[PDB]
Structure 1
Amino acid sequence: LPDSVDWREKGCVTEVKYQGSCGACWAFSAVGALEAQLKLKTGKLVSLSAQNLVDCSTKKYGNKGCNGGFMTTAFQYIIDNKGIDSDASYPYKAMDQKCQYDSAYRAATCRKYTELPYGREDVLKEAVANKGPVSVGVDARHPSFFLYRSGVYYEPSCTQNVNHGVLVVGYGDLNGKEYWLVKNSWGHNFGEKGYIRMARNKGNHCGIASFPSYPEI
């Protein structure tokens, strides 16, 4: 395994998105993971429709649109639906709408997804380095997370009780401090141009390795 990985350098990560008033973080996390696999299997990088997940992957998948959801069941919907539209063809309106999926504008599919073992940051590391960006839930309930601007985020009061779906796009070491490179969906103004480095190998800090999963085309 390389000492550090940054899938952005590999052109496998789309622009940072802004969820606005809608709490569809779970949706952005899922599409983000899939966008990387799409680029890896076709050479083309295209933003996938988060709105498509918000409107179509609902109750049957335990998801509540702007009120929360799961990245894994999001993947399950894409498998059952046999496709997901592109962001351009099904734009993000930041609100629950009636499902408007159109197979004519399908931009990607999903064959299956993998769930990683709870709390194993070593297995997550391997997945990030060999498979690609991984969807994860983290405890982002503390003010320190919102006010973050640079460096490696460490919050002594973080728990493994996750509530926020994000994407791990890499890992590295900064001044001896190990970290996970996390892509957020709160716009370019949050943290480092929309990204945040979280303490790595510090006993599953903020539950980042509690429930990881990634899709496969």
Structure 2
Amino acid sequence: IPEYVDWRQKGAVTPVKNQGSCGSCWAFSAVVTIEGIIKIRTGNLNEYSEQELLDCDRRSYGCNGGYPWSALQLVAQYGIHYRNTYPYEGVQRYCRSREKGPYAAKTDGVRQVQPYNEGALLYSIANQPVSVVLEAAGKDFQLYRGGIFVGPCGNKVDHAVAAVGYGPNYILIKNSWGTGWGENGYIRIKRGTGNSYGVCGLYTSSFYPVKN
């Protein structure tokens, strides 16, 4: 795998979104990985519906949090609508998948990256954007403005985001806090520190969709 990966330069990443006050990060992270795998496999970059996962993922808890893996498994079992068809409202509502016509895209499954393994996560990023989790509660992460982030942070992961690239000393992360946070909505998190958890627990729980 190459020294640098940046799925933004390969046209596989849509604009940065803002989840608002709703605890929907798990759905945004999952959606980032779906947009990426659909672009990689079909050549077209589309925006898909975070709201659909918020409403319809019966295993997750709407705005009270959820699981990127349940969201990816929902997209693999049923499918997902375009963001236009099922726009983001920032609040959990009734599942409206049947009333919005056929799904726009569908995947074939979900694979987990081997946790606590930097190379395994890098390998999965070299193939596609990956859903990852991290500890975002610390002021230092919340206030991140730019540069390669080294912390301080613990490993008590609480926030799902998406890894869309990496470099020799960092992993490139798409957050869902709007374009005004970090590096136009992105953060570069130091890697290669030898801590098995990853900086901010970045290697705790990583999933990506599979689409043949």
Q: TM-score, normalised by structure 1?
A: 0.92
Structure 1 moving runs of 4+ over 6 Å: none
Cα separation, 2, equivalents of 1:85 and 1:105:
8
Give matches, 1:27-176, under 5 Å. 27-58=27-58, 61=59, 63-80=60-77, 82-102=78-98, 104-129=101-126, 131-156=127-152, 158-173=153-168
1:79 is displaced (CA, Å) by 2.2
1:49/1:90 contact within 8 Å kept: yes
2:76/2:110 contact within 8 Å kept: no
Helix, strand or coil: the match of 1:33?
helix
Structure 1 residues 56 and 10: alpha-carbon distance in aligned structure 2, compared to 1, 3 A threshold: same
RMSD of Structure 2 on Structure 1 (CA): 1.1
Q: Does 1:201 align with 2:192?
A: yes
1:91 is displaced (CA, Å) by 0.4
2:29/2:131 contact within 8 Å kept: yes
Helix, strand or coil: the match of 2:63?
helix
Letter in 1 for 2:109: K
Letter in 1 for 2:160: G
Letter in 2 for 1:151: G
Q: TM-score, normalised by structure 2?
A: 0.94
Helix, strand or coil: the match of 1:84?
coil
The gaps in structure 2 that reach 5 residues or longer are: none
Cα separation, 2, equivalents of 1:142 and 1:44:
37
Helix, strand or coil: the match of 2:34?
helix
The gaps in structure 1 that reach 5 residues or longer are: none
Identity, % of aligned positions: 43
Letter in 1 for 2:115: Y
Aligned length: 207
